[PDB]
């Protein structure tokens, strides 16, 4: 393997490439939600416009005109009722995924936090043994033997 500390950088780098991928993907979900929201608003306005004439049709006793008008309205209502309900469910998906995203960000940053604090102990360890490696030589008849052999000389 590579120096897995380098992988810890690139592997977190992969998350950086994919964290934005989730970031862009989530935005696409929101775009559809609002776009679908408008279609509901437009339909009810037409239904309201039909109502605005049903707000004046049965007046003066033209009931049969109102019956035909309201009959047309139900089509828009049936479109309105069906379209409106689909919007509500999508909210749970966008809300939870943002919570999924928000939870991940702290985990990634918190995960990255321990990277530097923990990597230091590795650097300390290599020096700790290596500094004591040849340091241990000059005592206890290893290079103290060089201190002692020439004393014997």
């Amino acid at each position: 393997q590579e120096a897995p500390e380098d992988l810890l950088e690139r592997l977190l780098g992969e998350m950086e490439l994919e964290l934005i991928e989730l970031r862009r993907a989530l935005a696409q979900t929101i775009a559809t939600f609002k776009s679908t929201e408008r279609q509901r608003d437009a339909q009810q306005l037409i239904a309201q416009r039909w109502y605005e004439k049903a707000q004046a049709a049965l007046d003066r006793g033209n009931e049969q005109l109102a019956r035909e008008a309201l009959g047309q309205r139900q089509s828009y209502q049936s479109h309105t009722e069906a379209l409106g309900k689909s919007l509500g469910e999508q909210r749970a998906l966008v809300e939870q995924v943002r919570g999924q995203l928000q939870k991940l960000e702290r985990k990634y940053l918190e995960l990255k936090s321990q990277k530097n604090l923990y990597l230091a102990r590795l650097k300390s360890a290599i020096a700790a043994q290596k500094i004591e490696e040849i340091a241990g030589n000059l005592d206890n008849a290893s290079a103290s033997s060089l201190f002692e052999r020439i004393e014997t000389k």
Binding site: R23, L26, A27, Q28, I30, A31, K34, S35
Partner: peptide, 11 residues
């Protein structure tokens, strides 16, 4: 326009 405005909302 909906695509870009949503980007600002998230960021």
């Amino acid at each position: 326009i909906l695509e870009l405005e949503a980007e600002r909302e998230l960021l």
